[PDB]
């Protein structure tokens, strides 16, 4: 029994060991209570404004759309404290943890941005934070490992499986199933068992709410499309939520295409996987013929996950949102282009969304279109990875 619907059509649910059900129910009740609590809402709003820096800017690109009929704005979540959108919902969940009398936090991280967000919120709010991170990601997103540790978080490398986000997810959930009495699992994406996809969306929806107010102010109308990259789905659902009922507004989610869909080395289950049960949810996943979970791949650690949040699977199924993929090389070109022509260094995850928007423009350069890209994070964490690639490439 739940207070809220755990499903989005066929997708979602609470596919966890029985031991964890009371924790999920407790979380859901605490969330419902907090959502109607003016003191909670005021505390959360104050942290977002005065600590995290909201509202974040909406920047019109000045150069990259030259010579086309595309007007492109970037929602600047890269300016949020911590350097990505992850910080928004971490502040809300940290307050819920406190509300439930918990004093410890478990989190998984891939890009290290959710881990940084979790560490910073725990330092601020007096929680003991431990973060699981795949060993491959400890290497390719190393600046975030140093940031997490300086903030007093324990960072636990995960060597099992693919040593990437799914494996950090597995360890976090294993840990929680033994420590839930004292630890809150601060899941960092719009995926996993209910109530997480719902809470994460509700604690990210200020992204789209602000976008709407800002585009109305600057353009006097809604966007033709809003475009966001999709790992587990939090930044995309945060951007999408407030536009769902605005039927004219296109919702475009961008999965990582890795080395190319045809190679099997990607992270695009929504369009190229099939429905399975894993990580507490029924959702599209990359799986073998026998139902073993496949290892994903992407140049970007934040997108390197073989599943996707169930609300995205649902929005796709009914045709309300469209999902596409962008390869590693397309993402890199978009990264370079934004650095050199707009003076913004984007996260490689966010560069997938940008790459798609650039494609929309370039493919149809006389199509009148007003687009918003969710610039989910800054690329400081990626600069060594990108440098090394461009040098090996002979640039």
């Amino acid at each position: 029994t739940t207070l809220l619907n755990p499903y989005f059509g066929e997708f979602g649910g609470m596919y966890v060991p029985q031991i964890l059900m009371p924790a999920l129910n407790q979380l859901e009740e605490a969330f419902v209570s907090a959502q109607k609590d003016p003191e909670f809402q005021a505390q959360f709003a104050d942290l977002l404004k005065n600590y995290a820096g909201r509202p974040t800017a909406l920047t019109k690109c000045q150069n990259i759309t030259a010579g086309t009929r595309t007007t492109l704005y970037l929602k600047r979540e890269d300016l949020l404290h911590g350097g990505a959108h992850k910080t928004n919902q971490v502040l809300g969940q940290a307050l819920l943890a406190k509300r439930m009398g918990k004093s410890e936090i478990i989190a998984e991280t891939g890009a290290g941005q959710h881990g940084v967000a979790s560490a910073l919120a725990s330092a601020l709010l007096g929680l003991k934070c431990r973060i699981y991170m795949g060993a491959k990601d400890v290497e390719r997103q190393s600046p975030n490992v140093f940031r997490m540790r300086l903030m007093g978080a324990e960072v636990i490398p995960v060597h099992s499986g693919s040593a990437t986000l799914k494996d950090a997810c597995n360890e976090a959930l294993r840990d929680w199933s033994g420590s839930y009495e004292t630890a809150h699992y601060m899941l960092g994406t719009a995926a996993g068992p209910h109530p997480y996809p719902t809470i994460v969306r509700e604690f990210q929806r200020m992204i789209g709410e602000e976008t709407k107010a800002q585009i109305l102010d600057k353009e006097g109308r809604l966007p033709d499309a809003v475009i966001a990259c999709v790992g587990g789905g939090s930044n995309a659902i945060g951007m999408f939520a407030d536009f769902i009922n605005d039927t004219s507004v296109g919702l475009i989610g961008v999965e990582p295409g890795g080395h190319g869909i045809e190679t099997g080395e990607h992270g695009a289950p929504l369009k190229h996987g099939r429905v399975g049960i894993y990580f507490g949810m029924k959702a599209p996943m990359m799986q073998t013929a026998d139902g073993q979970i496949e290892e994903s791949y992407s140049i970007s650690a934040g997108l390197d996950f073989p599943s996707v949040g169930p609300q995205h699977a649902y929005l796709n199924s009914i045709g309300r949102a469209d999902y596409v993929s962008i390869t590693d090389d397309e993402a890199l070109e978009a990264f370079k282009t934004l650095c050199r022509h707009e003076g913004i260094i984007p996260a490689l995850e966010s560069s997938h969304a940008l790459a798609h928007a650039l494609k929309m423009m370039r493919e149809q350069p006389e199509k009148e279109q007003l687009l918003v890209v969710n610039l989910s994070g800054r690329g400081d964490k990626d600069i060594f990875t990108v440098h090394d690639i461009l040098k090996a490439r002979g640039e």
């Binding site: 029994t1 029985q18 009495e181 073993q292």
Partner: protein
Amino acid sequence: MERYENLFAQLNDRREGAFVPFVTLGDPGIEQSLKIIDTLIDAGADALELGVPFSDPLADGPTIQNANLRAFAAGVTPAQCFEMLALIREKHPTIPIGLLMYANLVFNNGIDAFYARCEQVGVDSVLVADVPVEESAPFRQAALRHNIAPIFICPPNADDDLLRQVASYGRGYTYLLSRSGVTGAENRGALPLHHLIEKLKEYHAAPALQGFGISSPEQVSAAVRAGAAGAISGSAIVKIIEKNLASPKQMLAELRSFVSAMKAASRA
């Protein structure tokens, strides 16, 4: 069939508890796994709990994670597990056989077809580790249609509504969880909770088998004296496999010694 029912009636007549080892099918290979299983039975196992190797076993600690990995390294697939199961049943007509499954392996090419395969090879129960009672409907329905017992979990902090649902929906045996966390021999299960054991009996639940962290004869005796119908041990058995990979004869001797001692303890 009625293999659990017959087993428990026999154990009761002998005023005895069950000892039920867990292993991963095909760990460290198909041939050795079959020999391991025959050794467990010859040494006194009353029933078996058998793992199908799964890529991401979220209820298992490192010991059994590593069993799954050894099976995959040997190229074990669920199809090969079903071939093994057929061979085990062919040798051992009455021993109850329960599968430890993760949901995706059951859901993969159709829930109904999965349980139909279980019936054909003569499996008696299926425990789907990541499907709580709240999500269990199509699983328990398919199990019962194919004469398979769906196994549900009674955790230490089970409330009354949960006790009633587990008693109603489950068959074969009730899983009495020793503790929170994941499988592991080093993390010792708590003493069996008398109140849960007694409430399950009051609600006519399938007999309880205590599991998680049971790695010593003393814990088996404690479970039975608390009123449980028996105990399950996985990681302790698997460590004997892991320790003796280069010594297959010593492996079977140590498995036999351990299983015999754990079974002796079930008579307390």
